[PDB]
A paper describes a structure:
Here, we report the use of the TPBLA to explore the role of the protein sequence in determining the aggregation of the naturally amyloidogenic protein, β2m. β2m is 99 residues in length (10.8 kDa) and has a seven-stranded β-sandwich immunoglobulin fold that is stabilized by a single disulphide bond linking Cys25 and Cys80 (31, 32). The protein forms the noncovalently bound light chain of the major histocompatibility complex class 1 (MHC 1) and is important for antigen presentation. Another example is β2m, in which aggregation of the wild-type (WT) protein is associated with the deposition of amyloid fibrils in the joints of patients undergoing long-term renal dialysis (dialysis-related amyloidosis [DRA]). More recently, two single-point variants of this protein, D76N and V27M, have been identified in amyloid deposits in the viscera or tongue, respectively, with the former occurring in the absence of kidney disease.
To examine the structural effect of other amino acid substitutions at this site, the crystal structures of seven variants (D76E-, D76A-, D76S-, D76G-, D76Q-, D76Y-, and D76K-β2m) were determined at high resolution (1.15 to 1.52 Å). Comparison of the crystal structures of D76E-, D76A-, D76S-, D76G-, D76Q-, D76Y-, and D76K-β2m with those of WT- and D76N-β2m revealed no substantial differences that could explain their different stabilities and aggregation propensities (RMSD < 0.6 Å over all heavy atoms). For D76N-β2m, the network of hydrogen bonds involving the sidechains of N42, T73, and Y78 found in the CD and EF loops of WT-β2m is maintained in the variant. For other variants, the loop structure is maintained despite these hydrogen bonds either not forming (D76A-, D76G-, and D76Y-β2m), or being reduced in number (D76K-β2m hydrogen bonds to N42, and D76S-β2m hydrogen bonds to N42 and T73). Comparing protein stability and aggregation suggests that variants that are most (Tm;app > 60 °C; WT-β2m) or least stable (Tm;app ≤ 48 °C; D76L-, D76P-, D76I-, D76W-, D76F-, D76C-, and D76R-β2m) either lose the ability to form amyloid fibrils or do so very slowly (with the sole exception of D76M-β2m: Tm;app 48.7 ± 0.4 °C and Thalf 10.3 ± 1.2 h).
Author numbering: 0 to 99
Amino acid sequence: MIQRTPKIQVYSRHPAENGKSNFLNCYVSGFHPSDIEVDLLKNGERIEKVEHSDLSFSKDWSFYLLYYTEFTPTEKYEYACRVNHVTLSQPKIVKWDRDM
């Protein structure tokens, strides 16, 4: 068995083909097992209808999830990615750094 704590990166991207659009991304990488719960949060609120949940694995024991959705970040909301994983005794909330 192997278990690997997801690395969690939360960042915003504009698709270059629609630069007006802003995507909050939670890139959850290198985890094993694949079982995971990943949410994007707006304050503590899970963002529903996260448009993209792209799971892949490299090695059979390394999973990568890009979990991202269009969002419109404003000051009034903190955005975060919340990951639960067996390796994470508590949900890991990685705040979107507004500069990221």
